[PDB]
Every structure is written in C-alpha cells, then in structure tokens.
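Researcher: Quick one. ten chains, 1007 residues in total.
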Amino acid sequence: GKCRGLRTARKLRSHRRDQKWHDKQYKKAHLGTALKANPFGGASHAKGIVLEKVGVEAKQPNSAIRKCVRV
Amino acid sequence: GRVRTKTVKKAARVIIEKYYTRLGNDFHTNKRVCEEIAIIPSKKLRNKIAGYVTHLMKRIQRGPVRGISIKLQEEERERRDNYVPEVSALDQEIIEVDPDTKEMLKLLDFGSLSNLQVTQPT
Amino acid sequence: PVNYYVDTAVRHVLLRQGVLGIKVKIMLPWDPTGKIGPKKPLPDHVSIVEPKDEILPTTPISEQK
Amino acid sequence: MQNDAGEFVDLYVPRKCSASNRIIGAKDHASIQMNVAEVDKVTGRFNGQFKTYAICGAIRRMGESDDSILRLAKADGIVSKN
Amino acid sequence: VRMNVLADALKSINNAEKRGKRQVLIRPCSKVIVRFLTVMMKHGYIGEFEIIDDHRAGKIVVNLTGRLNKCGVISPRFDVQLKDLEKWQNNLLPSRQFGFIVLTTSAGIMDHEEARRKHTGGKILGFFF
Amino acid sequence: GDSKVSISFENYRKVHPYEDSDSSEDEVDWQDTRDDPYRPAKPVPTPKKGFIGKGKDITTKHDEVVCGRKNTARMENFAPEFQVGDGIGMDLKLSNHVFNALKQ
Amino acid sequence: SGALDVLQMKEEDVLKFLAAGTHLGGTNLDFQMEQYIYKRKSDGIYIINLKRTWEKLLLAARAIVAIENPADVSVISSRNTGQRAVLKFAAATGATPIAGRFTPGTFTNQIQAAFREPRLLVVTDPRADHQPLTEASYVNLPTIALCNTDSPLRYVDIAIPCNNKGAHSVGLMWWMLAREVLRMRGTISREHPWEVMPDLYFYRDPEEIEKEEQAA
Amino acid sequence: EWMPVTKLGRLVKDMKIKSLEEIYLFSLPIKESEIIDFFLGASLKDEVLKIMPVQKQTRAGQRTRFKAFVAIGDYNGHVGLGVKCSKEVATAIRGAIILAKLSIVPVRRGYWGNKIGKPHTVPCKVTGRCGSVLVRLIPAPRGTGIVSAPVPKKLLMMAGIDDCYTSARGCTATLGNFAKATFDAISKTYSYLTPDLWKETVFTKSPYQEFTDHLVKT
RNA sequence: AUACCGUCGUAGUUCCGACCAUAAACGAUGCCGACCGGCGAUGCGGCGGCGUUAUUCCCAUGACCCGCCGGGCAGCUUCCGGGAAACCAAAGUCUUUGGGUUCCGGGGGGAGUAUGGUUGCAAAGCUGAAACUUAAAGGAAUUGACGGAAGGGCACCACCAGG
RNA sequence: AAAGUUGCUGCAGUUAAAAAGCUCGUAGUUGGAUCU
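Model:
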C-alpha cells in the first residue's frame, strides 16, 4: 500500500504532485497549453467582427438548422 | 372426465377429521350422516362428498393417510402401538464388548461387570 | 347464483363530450332471515358443525330419573 | 443511559449473552433464553427453581452453543466435574 | 518481517475477541505490550492476563471478557501535542463518554484523560474502545 | 374468512332469543350528505401574502399537509391505465419528490 | 447430575447402553463432537464416552422438566428408525410429536394448516432433520438433539452424543430420556424400576411385524 | 376488530404485556401488525419515501406495478421501513405500511456533551452498510439538527434523533439501499455495547414462561 | 469469391556464437510478517507404531496399513468476515478506517499516436504528449420479446373408418 | 466546498482504468525481545 512511516514526507509529496499531473482538471489548469490554445485567451468575453453567417446542422435525433456566425 | 374438485375433497377430509366416530364403509349411512352434520345445500353435492368418504375409508384400511391426522385412528393402531413382547432383546444373556470399551468400563469405575464377553478385533 | 346475488345496474351519464356507461354489480351477502340478502346459501358454500364434545365413558352408571 | 440528574433514561436495558457477553439484539431471532431445572440434593426432585442461560444468534449459528451450555452448566455445578 | 510487536499483539487480541474466544495467546511480548494491556485492564475492558516467561521473547496469555469493541495501534507513532489532543480523540474515539487513546509520555504509558490531568503530552501508541 | 367450506360454531352458542338486537344495525349513511369525504373542495383563492392567518397558527402556502393532499388529489387525474386506488379515504400526504417521480 | 449420588449412573443402564450399541458411533467424526468421544479403533469406528451421554441426558431432562406446560415441547423425528419411539414419548410426557414429513414453515408461517409455536425442540437426527433446526433458528427455540459422532452441531443447544443409526440405540435413548423426565417430574420413584419396558419403543420394521405375527 | 393468532398476540391483546419493550427485551418476533397498531396507536406517522414503477415482463407482455418505500416512526420512540411491490399505488402504500409496522425497532438515544436533560443524539458513531451504501451517524451537539440527505433526514426525524452529523459513502442514488443502510445503522444503535451496559444481566422470566397458565386456557 | 478446400514449396523450424527483450510472459491476484473455520486426499522429510510381504528372511532393512509434526502442490464445504456481485479462507481482520515497503490507475477516444532523448545492424524497444472529440464507454449478476430450437398435448367448427 | 473523483486524516489496482516477465541490487523508507 502506502509508505506510512514518520520520515516519509518527501516521498509522499513527490507522489502527490506526480500523480496530480494525471488529474484532468488540474492538468488542464496547469500544463498551460489549455490556456494557449484557448481562443478567448482566458477571457470571460471576447469581441470580434463578423466574417460570414453559417447554418450549422443539428445532431441526429434533433432536426433543425442552428443559426451560427463565423467571427 | 370424473375427477373430484377441491371443495368435495376438502369437505370430505374435514368430515373425516371430525365426527370420525359416526362414519362407516357403507355409502348410504354416509349419505344420511352428513345432513345432521353439515348444512350442505344440494343433494347432488351430498352424494359426491359422501362417496369420497367411503372411498377414503377404503383407503384407511390400507394404512396411514398423508392428508389426515386424527388421534383416534379406530381401535387397532392403539393396540399395536402399546404392544409389549414378553422378553426384551435388550436383556441379553451375554453382551459382546471390545477390549478398549472394556477399558472404558474400567475407567468408568464399573470394572466388576460380569455379563460382558470380550473378543479381540481379529 | 348470480341471479339472486349480484344486482347489475347499467346507467348512462350525459356529459358535455359524450356518454359514459356505468355498471354496478353488488354481490349481496347470504343474510338468511335478514332482508339484506337472500336466505338461500351459495350453492357450494357448506358449513360443518363442530362436534358437541360428549362425555367420555368412565364407569357404567345407571341413574334413575 | 444515566443522566447526571439521576434517571435511567433509556427504553430498556437488553439482556446479554452468557457465553460471549454480546448484546442480545432486538431482532436477534435466534436468541435463546433457556431454563435448566435445579434438583433436590438428597431426593432427586425438581424444586421449582431453575438457572437461566442466554445464547446469542451467532454462537448458535456456529454450532458452539452446546459447548457454551455445557461449560456454563459445569461452572454452575449442574454438571459434575469431568 | 516483523516490525511493531504491539501491532501484531493488538491485531491478535482484536481477532480472537471478534471470534468470541475466552483466552488469547500473543507472542512476542514486550514492555510496551505489558503496559498497554495494563492500562487496558485498569479500565475494566480486558481483565486478567499471564506472562509465560520463556527465556527468549516470552508469551502473554490474556483472559478476555466480551467488554471490548476494538483495540488498535496507531502507526507511525505521531507526536501528540496537548493542543492537538482533542482532534485525535475526535477522530479515533466513538464518543465523548467512553473509549480511550493510549499515549506514551515521559511520565509513562497512560491514557488521554490521565494525560490531560497530568498536563503532559507524548507520542501516541494506540487506542481502545 | 373466504373459504367455500366452512366450520360452524352453532353448537357452542348458548342463547340468542334477540338475534336482531339494535346494536349492529347502525345505518351508515354518508354518501349524499356533506359528511362524504369524497366531495369537491370549492376552492379558495391563494392569498397574495403567501400564507393564511396570523399569530402562531399560520398555515402557509407551502404546508406539507396541504401540499401532500393536493398532490394526491392531482394524482387522481392521471391516465386511466394508471392505477391509483383509494388514497382519499385514508389520509395521504404525498411529497413532491414522490409525486414528481410518479407524474414523470 | 450436580455430582449427586441419586442422579448418577446405574449398572443396569450400563448394560442397556452396551447391549444397545449406543457407545458404538460412526466412522467419520465432526470436530465439534471430539469433546464427547474418547478414541477411534483399529477398525475405524469411534467410541462414545457414555458418562458424557448420561450427563447430557440429565441436562436435557433438567431442561424439559423446567417447562411448566408439557404441551409446549415439540418432539420431532422424521426418519422411520425413530418415528415409533417419538410417538410414545408424547404418551410418556405429554409433548406434541411430529412424525413423518415435517411441513416447512410449521414454526414460522402463521397462516398455515399445521402452525404451532413451541418452547423447545427435541430431534432424533440433526443431519436428517435439518429443516426444524433452522425453523427453530427463526423463532427462538432451544433444541435438544441425539447427535452421532458425525453430526453437524448447527443450532443444537443440548447435544446428546449417542448412536442414532441403529434402531435399538434410538429406542433406548428415547426410553431413558422419557424415564428421566418422568423421574424428575416425580410421577415415578427413582428407586423402583420403570414398569414401561424399553423393548416397547423400538422400531417395528414391517417384515419383523409379519414374522412376529406368525410367531404368536 | 382484532383477536389474534399467535401466543404473543393473545398476551398483547389482554393486559398481561404492558409495553413494547417487553417484546424487544426477549427479541420475540412480531408476527401481527396489530401489536404495533395497538401499543403505539396514532403516534405512528408515515412518510412515503418513494414510489418507483417497475414494469414486469410477463406472458401477457409488460405490466406496470409500483414498489413503495414507506418509513413509519414514533417520534422520540421507534422507527421502521417497509417495501411493497403491488399493482395499485394506494394498496402498495398500505402494504408497505403493514410491512413497516413489522420492521419496527427501538432506537437508543444518548448525549453529545454533558448528560443534561433528555437524550438527543446517537450514543456513539455507528455505521450501517447495505449494498454499497454506507451511512455513518456521528453524535452532534444540541440544537444542530440533522445534517444529512433528505432520505436519512426523514428516517432520523421519525426515529426521534434531534441532532446528528451524517456521512454517507457509495452510490447513494439508489434510495432503497440508502434507506436500508441508515435503517441498519439505527438498528446497530442497540446492537452495540457501551460501558453503560456492563452490569450483569438479571434474567426475568419470559412472557411465555410467566403467563403459560393463562395460555393453557385458550 | 478474390476467404473456403486439397497439391508442391523458400526463409524459417535444428545446432553453434552474438543482437533483439516482447506475449492472453495470466493465479488476469507485488514482496515480507501476524491473527482468523472444518474435512480428507497427494508429494518430500522426520517421528511413533497392531499387523502384511523379501519363497516363514538368521539381526538390522526396503514395499503396504494406522496416526502425529513441518514446509509445499492442489480440491471439498461453511451465515469467519468481505464484496456491485460473480466469487474469495483471503480478494478476511476497511467509516470499529494506521504492521513495513515497491510499482501503478484517475470517464471514453485521439493513443501507447506525433515530437524529443536513449538502446538497437535492422525490425523494433524504453520513456511519451497535445490539439481536437463524446455522454457515456465499461463491470457483475436477473428475466425472456424471439428462436428461422426441440418436444408433447388438444379438437368430426381437424384427421382415420365411414355416413 | 461538494470531490473519500488526488485520498496525510481517507481512494483504488482478480473480472470495471490499473501489479513491473522474473530475480539480484545501491541511495531511500523501515526495522525482534532486552537494563529501576
């Protein structure tokens, strides 16, 4: 199981950070490519100029056309 | 076909279980005994539960019945129930013992028995 | 038995959209003397009287009365 | 069970097993409260007094109930020595 | 291999108590096991016991009563401040009325309540309730 | 109880001159009267303040008894294939989570 | 017996045990039975300590007599090898006997033709009568059983270690149990031997019934 | 009108048995719902925990029948839980009520801090496991209420515990497992041994033993 | 029909000396230690033995039979307790959570992919992402709509004998 | 915070994601009883 001695701190802390890099939400916060591939660049809002209008097709059981815009 | 329904069988078994004293192997007395016992509406029903009763006491003389249990059972099973032979096979004139059982007798401080006969396990 | 036990009653209620039929069938009891149901027992229901538990004989006794 | 005022504020105090001291449960339906008769010393007569033994469900399930009863009766002198 | 002879002994006592036994044999023995069972006994959980002195590490034969619920060891022996003693008895004990935590001080091997009385803290050894 | 063949205790009855003694002939009659529990409520408008009354006997809008009874009465108007029963004769207090599961 | 001289073993009863074959157990041996057995033979059959059997009879008699109403005890035997003995045990004591097949749910199912609530259970063979022991485990019945050397001691509260495979052994064990519960009840003097002679209780074995009918 | 079947029912019907604690003290099975209907009476309230419609597959196809989890409880007293699977939901609820009367069990109540007043909390932290659901009850200070999910909140109020910390583990979405698990814990309340209960038990005669002379007559 | 089937046939399969280091390399169960049920077989060693055979053995000695001990290989069974269950005397002693320690998993795909380092003659191996993508993917057990699965059994509104 | 879904308190690793193919081995971690 776990290393559970009294002089076992750096092994436990190294294990924590190493395995915490396998956490999806933590890695998404801290690898830093999820904030460099992010289109908004970590912004709540962005501002754009409309390039074209687009009709995106609906997904299978829902039948509609959704009105989107390429900005 | 001709198979007894549940009600005929059940009423006949109840008539067997209680008032067993007054019944008998003839049908017609069994035909007339139920009217003082059971308030049975139809006569065609009286005649069907009274036929199963005679058929069942024909089955009684073959021995015990797996459906009824009454502590009267006429007066014949009681007599063989308390049958006593004159001399018990238990009261044996000589009883066979094994030497380690003879040790059991020795250490159960009854070592002075005489009715035992001891043989080696040949 | 059905003839003197149930009381079939069919009525029509007239609502705004149409008609609904209502069928009430009340199985009366075997109330003998009673005027609630018919005295006649159900043709199958049989009642067996428990034995009046008589005195088991102990000694032959002749009592003059 | 017993507050500092002094009332024994509890619904009931359940009996305890005489073999392994466990609490006899409320829905411990394999529980046994068994009475074993006390005899007259000189005559061999049933006095009217008895000794009581409680067996829990678990010991009786393991089959160790008879051994528990025998050791209880032996320690209580219902069984002679040996 | 065998570390901690108090972990082995308390696990043996707990299992042989769970199976309803009247006596337990624990080997090896040790001064910390003797004092642990002593402070167990002073509180009326464990009752009598015996020390079979083989000339090697001897054995202890413990007479049990069914008054015990759980005897456990805390390994590693953490260092218990007196300011830390309530957050250990809120985590290991089942109540505020019964149960004890065995802790070792320079004043000896004792319980958490006697440690509170004597105002000293120590390392932890185990718990019993 | 319901067995076709029956056992009669006619022997053990001691005396019964007055079979129709006026004890069991209590005329139970509540259907056409206003003692019928199965009657419309003649609904009251909901107060704007959200509760009814003052003092300490305030029966509010969200009362568990009233809301449960209304949930059962709302359950009474389900589809015919749905089996309800007689939850009005006995007092039901059917909660919103239970009723929402059933309604769904 | 609480080491009472009145209650101790008698030489006639020793002879009865040795003639019956009650000491001669089975071949296999369950471990929880090891307390009642002394040793197996070069043959392979274990030998039962008869004084333990006697003491268990005394303890079972103390248990049965301790019930005020004699009809509370339900005394059961499903195997034919003891069906006849169990009947006269009722006639000896007043208990309610179960002979033949035991209807499952007799002790549990309250809406039942044969439903009854005992305060005790006496059983010939725990191997064969597995059902009433469990039904006792559902409804709080102390149980006395006549256990062999290879007998599961599940749900038995008094185990009487004896032979129960033979007919004579079963009959004699039931006989001394009935005799002892009557002696503790006080309807028979302990000094004078019981008039009911134990060859009454043995199995009849219908071919033996026939050859005894010609031998009349 | 009730007159019973069982010996315990006959003792309960007459004035021989004074409280339901006499039945619990000898762990006798309660085979008549009218015993609980008699002793507690109208003090039992009931809350339908859930009605889930299961569609059984038959030779006739697919048929809807409802399973009712119904918890009854005498506040500051007793608690029980019952499940029924029946065609119509009012009958399912009443059948679940009947089974929940026979499932009734006493709860032990203790104190968190100083033993002052009437007991309010579970005497010690207990745990109850039913099919991947673990419910742990922790003693809690006076006035804190029941910190728990709605299901064990209902069960613990109807059991009569005024205050309790509660911690659950598992797939607690299944309300059956969760309800039966907290029921397991509140049965383990008296299934536990505390140093309050260390005194040697005097054995009182069983009601069958005490009143066997009255039971002979009927 | 290019799978399918039968006929030949190279490297290979074999040995010797170096690389390669991967497998469903599986008990799908890290290693070391403690406690915790029963049974009756097996292997090895040891101990205690009525008796049986080396043509009766002249002493020891091998081979059967009854046990006991230790360490194994496995089976049967249990309401020891676990567990989602299948099942497990460990997968038990786990909310009553702490004997020591090592490795390793974090919804499913992309993906054991690209890139980089390193080993390798090579094929490859070890380490090993992300962008983007979906609300499931999965595990145990329970029934059966349906068999294109097989049996019976029924009926002058079916048949045989006929009218 | 809920997340005991980052687990020191306090997760998991037969079948759901997972025990290195196996053994040796250094640093590390851990380590029988014994003295007032």
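Helices of chain A lie at 9-20, 24-30.
Researcher: Thanks, that's what I needed.
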